[PDB]
Amino acid sequence: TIKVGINGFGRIGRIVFRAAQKRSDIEIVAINDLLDADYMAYMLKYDSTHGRFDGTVEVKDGHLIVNGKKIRVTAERDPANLKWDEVGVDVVAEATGLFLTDETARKHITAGAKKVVMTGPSKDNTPMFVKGANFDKYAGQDIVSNASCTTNCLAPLAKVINDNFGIIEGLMTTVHATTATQKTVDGPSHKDWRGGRGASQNIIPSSTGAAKAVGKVLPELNGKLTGMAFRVPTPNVSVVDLTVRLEKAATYEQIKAAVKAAAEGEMKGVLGYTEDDVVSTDFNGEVCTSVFDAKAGIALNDNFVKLVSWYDNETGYSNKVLDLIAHISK
Amino acid sequence: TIKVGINGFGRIGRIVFRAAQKRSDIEIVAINDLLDADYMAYMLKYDSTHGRFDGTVEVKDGHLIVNGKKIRVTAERDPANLKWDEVGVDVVAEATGLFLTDETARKHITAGAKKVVMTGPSKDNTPMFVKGANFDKYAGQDIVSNASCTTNCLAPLAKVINDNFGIIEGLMTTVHATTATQKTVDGPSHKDWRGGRGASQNIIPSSTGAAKAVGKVLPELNGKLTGMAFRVPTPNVSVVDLTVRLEKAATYEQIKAAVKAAAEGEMKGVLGYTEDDVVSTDFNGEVCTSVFDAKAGIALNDNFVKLVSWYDNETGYSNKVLDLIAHISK
């Protein structure tokens, strides 16, 4: 199995840790964060969004024992001190959102680590990989990025719609759930004023680089996409609203049939399809990084349409983070 | 097994149906309400609070096929027409809220059923029974009420404390979650002006017969308790705050010990005990109708203390609704 050491036990670090327990190829052997071992166990035991941990966890010797296995608990501010090799960490899940550049992220490899996977879009040119889109483009790089939860939702569906009718151009909107970066009441958000406003009281316009980033994972789409976000008061689960102009004419019945196909075949597990009357909570715990909502989407005509696809911005992304870890290791 | 027929597919009815599945002594055979089998299936398949139905459901000739078994569906306004014997129903779960009296519930019997269990406090003298409080007081009555969620949470804890230190008197407050009777925005509520104001916008003071009802379920407490509610903006899970005066002085440490005793002792399954830093969501899906929160309680002195216990007003209550069906079938 692959030895993984997570850096940052936030929303992502914790959900990837939970999802890893159900896999046979991966082993989490260490956690680093400025969290006491007993606090780390509490944050893992109870989750407001996903329920109590389906497993056992105990504190011992300053470390944790989860489901019978010992996990190294550290509190290193400087990653280049983590001595990952000592527990045998193969790939480090860089989930602090703080070291999204090769220079910073490499401090992990300097620290006895083999490879590192950013759990967020890189700030430098570090390559991002989205499952169902550009995984087969991996070139043995030791540092990569799993992109963002949104790109993980857009790229897959974009690819299918593109390869089938050609996307002339498109504008994406993501009605996204509240995240740890926001405030409970109007607070300071220097780099983004709207972002510091009361999260539960507002619909907050926000900017995302996920539409553009898709032109990076699916080069054929370079320059054909851009968009924005609206942060709304929900704790988890978001949705993309993709407005596209189609090269090849196509009826809505045809667009569905092609998404469903990719869903049942080539894209199985990454892209999903449904014709039920779903709402956001119906996707809390969703592993498919992109679920196409047939009845929600609408077409003005055969070359201009709006498509809707759901995504548990926590669960899906967290699983695909693990798939990329497996991937670059294989 | 015991044959159950649900009347009213609302929150209590739908969660009763669900919990009923993992049982064995009971079997749901029919469901009545004013919805189409396909709408009934949809409501059952997706729950915003408890997740997707863990099983199989589809429609077969205007009926439902859940987990492979056929569930009789009907949409009758008059209970006396349900012809419950055609499906050999033993007990009826009266979950409409419209038939909490003898002459209204009895219609079920007149329809071919054996006994009825109101899933709410009776409007008349019909006997209420709460697990862990007065089940042994059951005397073959054919129509009974399971009281309410709040009563099912308070009665068990009240009994233990009284039985142990003697309650001279107490006042209770339940910080309760929003329910189907409330409004999304300020709306009509002819018999309760506050209960009509936007649920998600306010902390809404409200009346509860709970406390007093404990005086009926636990006759030794008649006139010793009373209380109110504060409806807050959460979708499920409530908590009782009980301020009481004790006869025999007792330290918290001792109150803890006595409750933990009942917990694994006589009250197992009904009364729970935890010393963890829990919040409401951690009990979403809780079966025990009263989980004592050790750390949250406060004592001014050995004869004046405030005790808090959690309860999932949907899940816990519903489970006990089935426990009383089995009980009254002995």
UniProtKB/Swiss-Prot annotation, chains A, B:
Positions carrying N6-succinyllysine: 114, 123, 131, 191, 212, 216, 224, 248, 256, 260, 330
Record field: catalytic activity: D-glyceraldehyde 3-phosphate + phosphate + NAD(+) = (2R)-3-phospho-glyceroyl phosphate + NADH + H(+)
Sites bearing N6-acetyllysine, chain numbering: 131, 137, 191, 248
Quaternary structure and partners: Homotetramer.
Entries under Pfam families matching the protein: Gp_dh_C, Gp_dh_N
Any single biological process term in GO: glucose metabolic process
Protein's UniProt name: Glyceraldehyde-3-phosphate dehydrogenase A
Record-annotated active site: 149 (nucleophile)
InterPro entries in the cross-refs: GlycerAld/Erythrose_P_DH (IPR020831), GlycerAld_3-P_DH_AS (IPR020830), GlycerAld_3-P_DH_cat (IPR020829), GlycerAld_3-P_DH_NAD(P)-bd (IPR020828), Glyceraldehyde-3-P_DH_1 (IPR006424), NAD(P)-bd_dom_sf (IPR036291)
GO CC, any one term: membrane
Source species of the chain: Escherichia coli (strain K12)
